[model samples]
Target: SFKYESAVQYRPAPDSYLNPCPQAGRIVKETYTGINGTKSLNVYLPYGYDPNKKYNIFYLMHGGGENENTIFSNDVKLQNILDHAIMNGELEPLIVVTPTFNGGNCTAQNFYQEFRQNVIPFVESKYSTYAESTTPQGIAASRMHRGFGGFSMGGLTTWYVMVNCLDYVAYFMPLSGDYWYGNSPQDKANSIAEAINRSGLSKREYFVFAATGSEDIAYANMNPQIEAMKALPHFDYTSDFSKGNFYFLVAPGATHWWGYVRHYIYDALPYFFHELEHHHHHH
Candidate 1:
């Protein structure tokens, strides 16, 4: 078994405090030609970052009505979490980029077309990514080294991407979100499950992490949708360890606020990178 203690708060890895990184890395705000229009991204580089070394990366999304900096500062406060994790070596050094799904005016795609055609390419072109091309094959190869996650409506987007772009990343973390799409629970569950089945990637290569706070409104529909997801072939919600593609974390008393957001990041990211590292090695 995976020796995991059920924790919904921040827990550092062993020896993490032994060798701490000296840098908190840096956050850079940049703009590129995007899908619906020119787009902006808040990028966080890990400690001891070098523009020359390739590293695993994650494309984190933000909740609705939030500008690009909300995840970096407010909700997840990802900057601090990333800093602490990398400094402690609890997490392997990586790059994280948060892009707006607003389409600059209103809602855009969950797996927004520009994300694959523009954002990923733009970020990779500007950094040391494992990608050498944006071709289908290159993207598939790159998928072995990346992750996608978010909170609230952003959580919905993570599931959206998983259904459509399994080739875009090997890991996922959908925090404080559910499989809701302005429809009945039954309709949404079937659609998401069908999409996952159609992604063409084997079940072993996917990581579907669903998390919610006890008081969060998102917790309302989780039991049913998760059960729907559990019915898919190769999925499991039993056992103390993650023997399959999903892990659900419930923060004891947290609300849909920033209080527990950082902890979620601190808790989930290490698992994501760890999973991504061993993905292809499995099959």
Candidate 2:
């Protein structure tokens, strides 16, 4: 729970204006005050987005040294992915918001705070989020429809967020990135395990997709850390969401780049927004 006096300022990566958007949805940039100053993000609104429909949301984070735009960088074709998936009914229609974590320089604490205080408030309020007010009950009611994921350094931040905000986050996908520097992975494992336990959120209450390319350099540690969590009394790796909630996706012959990020994103997008169907009283 240490806070850096100086919060790492974040800025969005270059927009994909040159790249054509997928036919189903669109991307746009947004601004809000963060811990240090003004921060920006690129939001992908789903196709056929209607204010009357209460949609689920995915808060994505870019890797270390990358900005908010990395998800849509180059030919990753996220819009295309979502467009096709949603059009074919392979994926649920959801808002994807990419917020920069500034290469892990932003204290994970502040990043979460800014998201809670600024980012969530802005996106949920502006769009058709189900929150009734900014109170815990309201924000959490909205959180049941939310998902979170990241790659590389952003994956590290994902672990941080999962450890802290289980009450508000039902789905988590941390790809490629492993444990944080200066902190032992075992400690993180116990902390996250304890957080979920203390929050009274059982395996049936939440979902986790911890994925990595088998060819990635970070996979060695990532696998073991995930194993450590599985070793915890409550967590067991399973593709069967009904039995256990953790899914470990191993991409064979894939590297530690954004390409694998696309694979992970495509796989994880379908698993969100099911918390309400699973239980009536999570919070």
Candidate 3:
């Protein structure tokens, strides 16, 4: 039996409050053509955003058993958090996009492929964002500096996207993601190993944070992959590539819910957007 839960009826947050970047206009909800049929997107623009000015983008994903809207409602108050960040100058003005990854049964292989072919193109055309480079710096300066993240199943999808599509993003944050699928833990480990080998991540500059709640069921297994990644030899632009490439944070007293995700996001936003304030100034 499929373990799907229908979302309860709820009203959207007030527009005046939700629209933080008034200049960028209201959050636009539209459907894009995908590998299967169509997928939905929730786009947030910065206040006073100018279409001509290329803004950075943050793609947020939702966990399993939930759709795109749930990320805004159930997972975390993303819009509110982001609005405050921009208002407070913690992050540069940018766009935020959330998409549904319901690619026929949610298999990793299938979902990854769909995300590459369908989702990327559709979003790029519809919004002002960047593409075609995997390096952290390059991705951060795309048409709009771009970052990707998700929670739970969405977190797993974030891993797949970064590994397979490294040339596509600058920063990646996956909260409580499942590293492997299928019935066997070994199979999952092997798959992850292959993904790491195939991903052309050369430097340790790419910002990545894999977080899980202490109470999450997947924590124990996820730690192994975290350790393995830290043990690998990173790429070298300087004299030597010597350190692990990502950060792992384990919330000591959180659960498998939005509260935990919020903590992860709060910590990650700085690392993800640190370059924006200076990129334009230096370049």
Candidate 4:
């Protein structure tokens, strides 16, 4: 009953929601030392962000040719979308970080290390995230409160992050990108399966919410990867994260642009930190 394929209900925000509000969250720039020397990132703090209150954190990577500013810049302006979603009770108040993988050493295959070693500590320590400390053990203990997602090249990086940093990231939302570890779909799926098999975590402890457009250029690549993953025992295909840990969402008429990917983010983000909130409500 939990294996049916599902489509991501594409919901765009209202016009007023896109308009800037005085109470909206603010985006600030921060710099950290990564594999490629000093690199910068943009951090989005929800409205009324308080250091005393702990919140979930998500790292959003930009595709090739895009920088950290792309998300909150004039073109995307995702901060407005997030602010209204949180304020309107559609999404929980969480920290969103946009980091780039542009430099020569910061390729998608290598960005995961930078993310695991530098970005996590630098961002988590400066903010009131669920991680009490930035050490390896501290980060591992709070894995459920952290997620990683991206589009295009960043989406490919998302899969690499899952394969390499599964212990640090619990939820993954890779849009319009497929794993490039191998040319064949089986090889790509096997790589992910190997990662999950090595992670030592059960299906309930991890979630993969992938989305792509039917007409997107990457659909031919991503669709087969998902199908291959479904045949593997590690991934359970279903929209309900509570029952199954993996699901692929196809948006009708969607393209390989961020315009459609933003909707996927809106649909996937709410599902990331629900388990932590579920625990809180039981108290």
Give lDDT per model, in order.
Answer: 0.71, 0.71, 0.61, 0.84
Give TM-scores for every candidate, taking all chains together and pairing residue i with residue i: 0.85, 0.85, 0.75, 0.94
Deviation in angstroms for 220 in model 4? 0.7
C-alpha RMSD for every candidate? 4.1, 9.0, 9.2, 3.0
lDDT of 1 by residue, 37-124 (tens): 7768899888778877778888888887786788777444567667766765566788999888875543534445667778888888
Q: Once superposed on the true structure, which residue ranges of model 2 sit more than 4 Å away at CA?
A: 1-22, 103-110, 181-185, 278-283
Any residue pairs clashing in model 2, and if so which?
none
Q: Quote the lDDT for 95 in model 4.
A: 96
**lDDT (Cα) of model 3:** 0.61
Please give, for residues 1-283, the per-residue lDDT of candidate 2 as tens digits. 1111111122112244223535558788988775646778888888888988777889988876678887776646566666766766666677899988763346544477667667787778788766766566788876677778888877877877787778777888888887663266677678877788898876777788778887988798887788777778767667545456777787778888875567567666665565555334221
Ordering by lDDT:
4, 2, 1, 3
In model 2, the worst 10-residue window by lDDT is 1-10
Tens digit of per-residue lDDT, candidate 4, span 85-118: 8987777789999998876488876899888889
